[PDB]
Amino acid sequence: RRQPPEEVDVLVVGAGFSGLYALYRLRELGRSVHVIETAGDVGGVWYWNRYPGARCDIESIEYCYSFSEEVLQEWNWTERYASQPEILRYINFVADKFDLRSGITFHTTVTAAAFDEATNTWTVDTNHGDRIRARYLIMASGQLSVPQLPNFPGLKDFAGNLYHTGNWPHEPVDFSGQRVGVIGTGSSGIQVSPQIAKQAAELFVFQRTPHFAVPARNAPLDPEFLADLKKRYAEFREESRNTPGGTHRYQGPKSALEVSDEELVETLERYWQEGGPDILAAYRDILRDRDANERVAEFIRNKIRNTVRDPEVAERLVPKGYPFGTKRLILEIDYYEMFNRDNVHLVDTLSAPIETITPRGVRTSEREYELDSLVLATGFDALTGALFKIDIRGVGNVALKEKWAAGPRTYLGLSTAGFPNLFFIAGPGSPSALSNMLVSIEQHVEWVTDHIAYMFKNGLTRSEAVLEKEDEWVEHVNEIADETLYPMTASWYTGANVPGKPRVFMLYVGGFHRYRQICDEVAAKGYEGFVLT
Ligand SMILES: Cc1cc2nc3c(=O)[nH]c(=O)nc-3n(C[C@H](O)[C@H](O)[C@H](O)COP(=O)(O)OP(=O)(O)OC[C@H]3O[C@@H](n4cnc5c(N)ncnc54)[C@H](O)[C@@H]3O)c2cc1C
Ligand SMILES: NC(=O)c1ccc[n+]([C@@H]2O[C@H](COP(=O)([O-])OP(=O)(O)OC[C@H]3O[C@@H](n4cnc5c(N)ncnc54)[C@H](OP(=O)(O)O)[C@@H]3O)[C@@H](O)[C@H]2O)c1
């Protein structure tokens, strides 16, 4: 274990994409910097989510770092969408290439942090009894990083084996000959389920609200195409940075309302055969207008009905009650096809709610299911869950957990008034998961670490967001969300999946590009909306 230093210019919490880049860039900027991370090695989500089928939904060529020309030229992606093992190899490659581990303490969880107004510094404690004095504190602790259990009793009475996809065993788990249940059909359950169906004697899929999924159509990556792309890589990334969604997705200029049914069908059919998430921007108003949205959703529901032979089973898979795209769009690989197998069962817990877990399985309001193993694909305590596990204290002993009890309050998502010198990477109040996260994450890490270099350059030692600019930012974030269909639906974006958590859409929806312009204008004017001393 790397004993962490007693004093540092910048402390970083988290060694996933965000944390490693912050460590890297801070080093280049001549600052002392060190990382604390709970896990035994680097990766973040790609270290933790080792469940079979784990795979990215953003193209390998887009979902990657661009800060290093060498890494761009040297690394060879192999598939349209990178599997978890492949991305963890990439992360390991990058960590090795810049000697990053020497600046990280592993197996160590930060527990508390308190700002000292006398010294303009943070003092940060860990579960190993370490205390670290840092002038700046960068929370790179994730968006989807605290596993959430589902809300029913009897979990600790189950006699069989119990798993969560976000805390998956390090060695392959063997489901051979078993009766297996999976609870949850978001992207984790959609990915892990077809893999388990290949080992288990019987698989029970416990669905509540159906999520919309479209075919991935993964494929080998052409090494022609790659070597070619490599010739203009820095240029291609810059094209992805100047978009709402951080990828080469085509921005459809028309309205899903202006077009005829025939042109609607033909256009959606070509996104469907191509595969991938780009259908989300097929028409400009899919996320803005309920009647627009509904023509798309209805096309997708019919595609779903047509994938499964038994029509009672197919109708059970059709998403109902919320607009298309307002929960995260999922990419599926042999998920729908799966339900055509003899040994796979769709359990509709909308009609038959789960009452309790029992020693032998799952009780709904209609019957009991006997199981040997149970897999929880029940998601995460998103965006705030990880910060809330740490006792973070601002000016006048204000707890972050209390100040944000009605939902997260930030200027630009980057900082919160009352908490000087503290930064969140790609979290609430910013574009975050509504963009290619590597483009969200690089922008934030660049902006924060520039900011810090600006502070040190100019002999300043305290950076704090102006409370009024915060409040105006929060209202702004809420106002632009309320022009979309996003706040209409219960998802983890809204916090609706953690019992008692306030239901407020937590993300900036105006697009990465515009958000980035705003941050650039701010930093240009000497960090307008911050007070520096
Ligand atoms: C399974 C999965 C697949 C994903 N696929 C996509 C994809 O399709 N497209 C996309 O753009 N992004 C996707 N993401 C979202 C993902 O959050 C981002 O892509 C990116 O990986 C986040 O990187 P990060 O470093 O900011 O956070 P993380 O990868 O979550 O890393 C945070 C790290 O901090 C650690 N940590 C938290 N609290 C503490 C503490 N108190 N003390 C010490 N350490 C702590 C955690 O152990 C974790 O290792 C996916 C998320 C998941 C869960
Ligand atoms: N390739 C990828 O892109 C990929 C893969 C995995 C994860 N991720 C990222 O992580 C986010 C979370 O993915 P996720 O699938 O882990 O979590 P999720 O999207 O939060 O879905 C959790 C699932 O479990 C269900 N659930 C929760 N509580 C339940 C209960 N008490 N009873 C029955 N069912 C219950 C939810 O049902 P309801 O919807 O009815 O609440 C939903 O089906 C994704 O949206 C994406 O951002 C990405």
From Swiss-Prot:
It catalyses: phenylacetone + NADPH + O2 + H(+) = benzyl acetate + NADP(+) + H2O. Monomer. Its cofactor is FAD. The keyword ATP-binding does not apply. Optimum pH is 8.0. Belongs to the FAD-binding monooxygenase family. This is Phenylacetone monooxygenase. Binds 1 FAD per subunit. NADP(+) binds at residues 55-57, 185-191, 208-209, 327-328, 492. GO terms for molecular function: flavin adenine dinucleotide binding; N,N-dimethylaniline monooxygenase activity; NADP binding; phenylacetone monooxygenase activity. It comes from Thermobifida fusca (strain YX). Disulfide bonds: none annotated. It is an enzyme of class 1 (oxidoreductase). The keyword Oxidoreductase applies. InterPro entries: FAD-binding_Monooxygenases, FAD/NAD-bd_sf, Flavin_mOase-like.
